[PDB]
Design a protein around this nucleic acid. Structure first.
Lengths: 83, 73, 162, 95, 80, 62, 82, 72, 81
RNA sequence: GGAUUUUUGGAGCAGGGAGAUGGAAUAGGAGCUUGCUCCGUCCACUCCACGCAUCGACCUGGUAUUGCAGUACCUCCAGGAACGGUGC
């Protein structure tokens, strides 16, 4: 049904997170709008494209289908999902 | 069964990374809950700096894993 | 007093200051260096704050080790088989220790991975040409007494004592 | 359930998977073609919609470049296969 | 019916899984759900150009598996 | 600890399944069953049920 | 069944879509089973491109990572629960 | 307008060259490809880059390989 | 606010025009599918007419006729005629 | 509940050329072991087109800042490429 994964994504949206995509497209920035289908909207992000020129763009639409992972708030380690 | 949130970004400029490392520079114009964001005034960007204006690209979210913003909308 | 795998498993193996896996055993005065590999390949730092270890010896095969705290200890000498058991080792911080003479620097050079070291508060400190002996024996070193090594220091340390 | 499995037999039998249907009603040793280029030859013992087939007398071969690739060949008699790694399921090879 | 249910006839069963990343492993898996989800145990795994790496409790995925090998004392018709 | 497998019993059963699986993957015979396995693994130096002039000898050595 | 539901909360090496091993103190599962790995890191092969240079792995830590469901190749335990 | 169903039905049996995702172009008369898009031809030969090379004939492909399908 | 112009609306207007376009592919941006679509369905599995493979690096065009390319290996198209 | 976002998969594969340059002790074939000739897997040096650019971290010396706040990452010049993946 509903995913505590999606609850984690909702607790990771809105602020600085760091998504990592398929070919190395990794965007560290304000993952503003993520919908449970994971098409993450990031804001004011610094994305590498795995290119090592990890350049800063604004309001990117990084799909989550290619998202290898997503570094979330290190302050919600005491989540309500795990607790 | 939920449409995507391209709502304030519609009718505005995005530079998208789709598979094949390709880029589609265009206007957000049309979509479905399948996220198939369709870009008019959309132009291709290849591996080399070559770029062709495509008229109206209905670019499926089947591949496009990125797209950045040109403005604030 | 028995220092066991009780105090090594109950030790804290989690995020260090520089965001690495550190395993603290503070508050034991443990003089026994045994039963450690039960960190289970998920550890890089072994810390024995408040220890009385008769010298530097007694570690298991850790190809991953990235920090070790042997400060506030009873280190008198320096044991031999350190490199093959710490090839990933750069941080073996043994300050507040009691190393005395440059014969305690005999296994210090055989590592290819030593760059971030500390042996502070030892009688090997105020001795003349002690940092010279160090800058001779430690090729790949970068962090020595919390200030960079120098190519001038390396020239001095190679050229002297032929 | 009942009418659904009736239509299901009709689908596996009179549809595209007729190759595996004949491998099951005829006990044929059929070439399951992987999408990853590992040719397994053998029967079809359990088979269904998604091309999920369990093969008996299974023999897997690969083009292994140590050079000029050799046919790496082994034969595990019984072994299962899901239909995702499969590109094809062909009833009849010439061997 | 599907052969996912035929692979559901495997618990305390000596199997061999060739997975998606060039993997080949011997395993007595822990328990398998309807979407092929078969978690390995005491398994000796070797991906492409690898070692016999050991996992005492591991969770081998579904669509990220390629080939499965059942026991020899396993009646096929009785397993499907 | 590691000297006893599941069914082996610390000295009650042994590991013939692994060499049996290796011989199966080698010979690939539609009737290489319990009787043939036990006959090949019981005797000492008969005319073997597989070619020893191939890697079957090395597999027996393993 | 929910097999991992016993082995969660410990540092577990989750495998990747590209063959890495990432020891995160795993939390929870799903129907897609997207991972929420806390105190989580990663490490992959630093390929020498040669043989007289040897192979290692450079250390990366994400902390808490929300690995999308398309990730797992396996999930094994590499750290007991702290 | 000639939708998937009518077009692939008038070509189901017409000798199709069907390009798979690794160079495989089947040359043969399809049996049936229903909504599951599972292909299967009768007396189809293998091709790599359009070179007829194999004789397996009535072979049944998963659609997950299919790049293209045309009736020659 | 603003209303949706479906990608199926794009494909439908293209087919009604019976127009020739070249289409993009997956994991290989070198090759393009130059042809016209004949019809459609609710699935967007692109069916094509008089199509040909056109290579960037190689610079060749191998024609199929009324071909049925995959539906998931589509990305987009440029209407060339 | 195997069709454009996660679990019935686009996965597999191969490292650019050459010089009377070289190592295989325990491991390749034939000329029926040793000697010697040619032959289908790498790395060290050197020639091209240090396989080509970006950037990031670092080693080198010079160089600006004495300052309180929770970090993708914060000096500037210059060298070298010991390391990473991005386009060919």
């Amino acid at each position: 049904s509903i995913g505590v994964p999606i609850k984690v994504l909702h607790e990771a949206e809105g602020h600085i997170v760091t998504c990592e995509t398929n070919t190395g497209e990794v965007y560290r920035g304000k993952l503003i709008e993520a919908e449970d289908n994971m098409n993450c909207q990031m804001s004011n992000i610094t994305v590498t494209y795995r290119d090592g020129r990890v350049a800063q763009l604004e309001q990117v639409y990084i799909r989550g289908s290619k998202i290898r992972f997503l570094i979330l708030p290190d302050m919600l380690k005491n989540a309500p999902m795990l607790k | 069964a939920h449409p995507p949130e391209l709502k304030k970004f519609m009718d505005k400029k995005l530079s998208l990374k789709l598979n094949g490392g390709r880029h589609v520079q265009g206007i957000l114009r049309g979509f479905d809950p399948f996220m198939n964001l369709v870009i008019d005034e959309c132009v291709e960007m290849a591996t080399s700096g070559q770029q062709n204006n495509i008229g109206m690209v209905v670019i499926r979210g089947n591949s496009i894993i990125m797209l950045e913003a040109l403005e604030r909308v | 007093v028995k220092l066991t795998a009780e105090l090594i498993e109950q030790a804290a193996q989690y995020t260090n200051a520089v965001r690495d896996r550190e395993l603290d055993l503070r508050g034991y005065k443990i003089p026994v260096i045994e039963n450690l590999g039960a960190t289970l390949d998920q550890f890089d730092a072994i810390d024995f704050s408040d220890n009385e270890i008769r010298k530097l010896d007694g570690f298991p095969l850790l190809r991953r080790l990235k920090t070790l705290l042997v400060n506030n200890n009873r280190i008198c000498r320096i044991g031999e088989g350190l490199d093959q058991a710490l090839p990933c080792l750069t941080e073996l911080i043994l300050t507040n220790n009691s190393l005395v003479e440059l014969g305690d620097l005999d296994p210090l050079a055989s590592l290819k991975s030593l760059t971030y070291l500390s042996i502070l508060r030892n009688p090997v400190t105020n001795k003349k040409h002690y940092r010279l002996y160090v800058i001779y024996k430690v090729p790949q070193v970068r962090v020595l007494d919390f200030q960079k090594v120098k190519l001038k220091e390396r020239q001095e340390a190679e050229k002297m004592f032929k | 359930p009942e009418e659904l499995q009736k239509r299901e037999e009709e689908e596996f039998n009179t549809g595209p998977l007729s190759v595996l249907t004949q491998s099951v009603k005829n006990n044929t040793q059929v070439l399951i073609n992987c999408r990853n280029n590992k040719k397994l030859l053998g029967r079809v013992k359990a088979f269904d919609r998604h091309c999920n087939m369990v093969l008996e007398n299974v023999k897997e071969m690969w083009t292994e470049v140590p050079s000029k690739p050799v046919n790496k060949d082994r034969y595990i008699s019984k072994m299962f296969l899901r239909g995702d790694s499969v590109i094809v399921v062909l009833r009849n090879p010439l061997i | 019916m599907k052969l996912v249910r035929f692979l559901m006839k495997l618990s305390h069963e000596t199997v061999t899984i060739e997975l998606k990343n060039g993997t080949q492993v011997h395993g007595t898996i822990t328990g398998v759900d309807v979407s092929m989800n078969t978690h390995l145990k005491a398994v000796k795994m070797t991906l492409k150009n690898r070692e016999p790496v050991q996992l005492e409790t591991l969770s081998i995925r579904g669509n990220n598996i390629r080939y499965f090998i059942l026991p020899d004392s396993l009646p096929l018709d009785t397993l499907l | 600890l590691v000297e006893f497998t599941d069914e082996e019993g610390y000295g009650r059963y042994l590991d013939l399944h692994d060499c049996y699986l290796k011989y199966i993957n080698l010979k690939a015979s539609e009737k290489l069953d319990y009787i043939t396995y036990l006959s090949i693994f019981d005797q000492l130096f008969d005319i073997p049920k597989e070619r020893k002039n191939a890697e079957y000898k090395r597999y027996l050595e393993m | 069944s929910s097999k991992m539901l016993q082995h969660i909360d410990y540092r577990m090496r989750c495998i990747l879509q590209d063959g890495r091993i990432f020891i995160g103190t795993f939390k929870a599962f799903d129907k897609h089973m997207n991972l929420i790995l806390c105190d989580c890191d990663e490490f992959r092969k630093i390929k020498p491109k040669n043989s007289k240079q040897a192979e290692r792995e450079e250390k990366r830590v994400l902390g808490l990572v929300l690995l999308r469901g398309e990730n797992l190749v396996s999930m094994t335990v590499e750290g007991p629960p702290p | 307008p000639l939708n998937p169903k009518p077009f692939l039905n008038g070509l189901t049996g017409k000798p199709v060259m069907v390009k798979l995702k690794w160079g495989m172009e089947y040359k043969g008369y399809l049996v049936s490809v229903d909504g599951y898009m599972n292909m299967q031809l009768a007396n189809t030969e293998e091709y790599i880059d359009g070179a007829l090379s194999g004789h397996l004939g009535e072979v049944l492909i998963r659609c997950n390989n299919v790049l293209y399908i045309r009736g020659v | 606010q603003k209303v949706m112009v479906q990608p199926i609306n794009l494909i439908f207007r293209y087919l009604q025009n019976r127009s020739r376009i070249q289409v993009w592919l997956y994991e290989q941006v070198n090759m393009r599918i130059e042809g016209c679509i004949i019809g459609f369905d609710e699935y967007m599995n692109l069916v094509l007419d008089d199509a040909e493979e056109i290579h960037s690096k190689t610079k060749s065009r191998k024609q199929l006729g009324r071909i049925m390319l995959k539906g998931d290996n589509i990305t987009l198209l440029q209407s060339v005629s």
